Design a protein around this ligand. Structure first.
Ligand SMILES: CCCCCCCC/C=C/CCCCCCCC(=O)O[C@H](COC(=O)CCCCCCCCCCCCCCC)COP(=O)([O-])O[C@@H]1[C@H](O)[C@H](O)[C@@H](O)[C@H](O)[C@H]1O
Ligand SMILES: CCCCCCCC/C=C/CCCCCCCC(=O)O[C@H](COC(=O)CCCCCCCCCCCCCCC)COP(=O)([O-])O[C@@H]1[C@H](O)[C@H](O)[C@@H](O)[C@H](O)[C@H]1O
Ligand SMILES: [Fe+3]
Ligand SMILES: [Fe+3]
Lengths: 309, 309
């Protein structure tokens, strides 16, 4: 079934995609296209991939893009996590150590969330009779424990049904999405609701492929973070919550040591009063340590197309 | 910049996509996914592809799918032609020789076109004052020249502006698309208009990438064919027209020896009368030779998602 060897493949790819060039070429795009096409052709030879199979793959990719699910698929196949594995190894080779660990962004960030100093309430109260109240708090410091005032703590997470605002058009705009600037003591406090883990859209393209792979499409409960500050490396991270069925079986492979938090229960009447609440709530501490930006440091910032509102 | 070797990549891909499987798996889909992901990860290592670059690639693929242009991109990068190169080599190894050569289908077939016996007029006459009339005719035979009656000759082509019906919603439904069944003499005749070659949509995703590659997105003038008959191998082919600027510079690499036709000019008053026309016209002969279906023969039919109306 081998109709072409790699030499013959490379010659064909060059004839079609390089020899045909006239005028200015983007050299990087040319390099990447030539490599990926040659690899695709060689996989077609090695696995004897039939035209009907190739068309099914392209039809799948078309459907995935129309469903806006390619970011989700990048998470599920483990490509998004792989990019973090690479970034961690690049940082190790730079001698950059310390700092809260990174993990995946996911595909559901939205720019433009309400900003406040030191404290934000993240939810609109529309689920107050059906989900636990959660307070999250932490201090943002450098690697030696010195507080950072004015650090930008961006948080987003799912509602009691595992759905995110903007994508779920039934929620109010920016529900469960906030930017909190750390106060004079380096502190942030978020008053919110307990996120639940969630699956992929069950009739969607990502779950369709996971089904063929015998795989589930679930993530454990988590809260996403961007943390940034002048003079420090930007951090993309999350915490997961101890106790979740899928904690160490995340379909997007994002859970890490250092990023698992325990939700404590507060039933004490005095403490409840102090928080201006009326019922028991859950409490999570999540401190963040940022690494100073050095001339030698690889960038920790990632350009990516992101929703805005 | 090499953070992982292929052994480490393969182990990671297995951990994420295979070890996580529970219950029935589609073994072929699993095999192909594992191979393509491992290859993608290795290309990322070898070329030190940055997260921002990966996200740009996925955003491009998303945009391409939303624009319904991935079939067009398959043609332009030469993947569609490569599939034919493979099919030709498989046929050679089977000892299948003879027959009109195959070439690419393109992405613009529509099922459901008007059917008639022996003769069809393909155009609605809406361009009669701005484009040349073309008569196409041919005989469909086996490899020894014996006529085949009742062969299904499916033809589609572009209008005077290089646009195809169904996709160009300004044209009448099925304009320049017909199915003609060969008559008792194995003959088909199509009365139509001269197609013009065309480019990719200039603001679309395919041309955007071709621009980065320094490449044009043009095809020479051509008419597409499916030819099928009981007992014979289905044929996907075209003819191109001698004289076209892009005849041997097709951005989708479809031109072949054996598939170039010369448009003859008919100015003779007697012949014009015979055809029931009033002006000179162009004439193309395109005969088709079909190969008998043998038990040993690979399939020449391709399952593919196709428009219908
Ligand atoms: C670049 C080009 C390379 C790829 C292109 C070339 C590679 C060729 C790939 C060949 C794959 C083998 C095909 C085997 C035959 C298919 C059988 C089948 O059951 O049909 C369908 C399966 O088709 C597939 O999903 C296979 C394609 C997956 C390839 C992409 C893997 C990406 C890997 C690496 C890239 C990095 C990944 C990047 C990270 C994002 C089942 O139907 P469906 O549930 O999948 O979808 C269903 C469905 O079909 C329903 O009918 C519909 O109603 C519903 O909505 C839909 O969900
Ligand atoms: C499976 C996953 C693998 C890939 C995923 C992983 C691989 C990662 C790929 C990395 C590529 C290198 C990126 C370099 C930096 C980009 C710079 C730039 O100028 O930005 C843009 C270029 O971005 C690209 O097109 C690069 C991605 C191409 C990769 C796909 C090749 C497929 C090969 C093989 C697969 C078989 C092919 C299959 C056959 C079909 C220029 O803008 P634009 O004109 O391209 O689009 C423009 C634009 O950006 C405008 O802003 C917009 O308005 C307009 O509409 C749009 O058209
Ligand atoms: Fe999330
Ligand atoms: Fe065409």
């Amino acid at each position: 079934h081998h109709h072409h060897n790699r030499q013959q493949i490379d010659a064909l790819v060059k004839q079609m995609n390089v020899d045909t060039a006239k005028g200015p070429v983007d050299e990087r795009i040319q390099q990447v296209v030539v490599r990926l096409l040659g690899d695709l052709f060689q996989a077609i030879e090695d696995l004897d991939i039939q035209p009907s199979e190739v068309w099914k793959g392209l039809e799948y990719l078309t459907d995935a893009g129309q469903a806006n699910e390619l970011g989700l698929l990048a998470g599920g196949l483990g490509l998004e996590h792989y990019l973090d594995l690479r970034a961690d190894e690049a940082d190790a080779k730079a001698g950059i150590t310390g700092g809260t660990p990174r993990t995946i962004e996911g595909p559901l960030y939205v720019a433009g969330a309400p900003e406040s100093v030191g404290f934000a309430r993240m939810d609109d109260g529309s689920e107050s009779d059906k989900v636990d109240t959660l307070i999250i708090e932490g201090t943002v410091t450098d690697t030696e424990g010195n507080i950072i005032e004015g650090a930008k703590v961006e948080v987003w997470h799912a509602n009691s049904l595992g759905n995110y605002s903007f994508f779920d058009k039934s929620q109010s705009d920016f529900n469960l999405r906030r930017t909190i600037l750390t106060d004079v003591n380096g502190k942030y406090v978020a008053l919110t609701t307990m996120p639940v883990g969630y699956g992929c859209p069950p009739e969607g393209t990502t779950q369709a492929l996971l089904n063929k792979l015998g795989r589930h499409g679930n993530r454990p409960s988590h809260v996403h973070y961007f943390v940034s500050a002048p003079g420090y490396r930007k951090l993309t991270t999350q915490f997961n919550i101890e106790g979740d069925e899928y904690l160490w079986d995340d379909f997007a492979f994002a859970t890490r040591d250092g990023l698992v938090a325990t939700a404590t229960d507060v039933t004490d009447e005095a403490e409840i009063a102090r928080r201006e609440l009326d019922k028991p709530f859950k409490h999570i501490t999540f401190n963040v340590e940022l690494v100073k930006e050095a001339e030698a440091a690889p960038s920790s910032e990632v350009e990516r197309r992101r929703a805005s509102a």
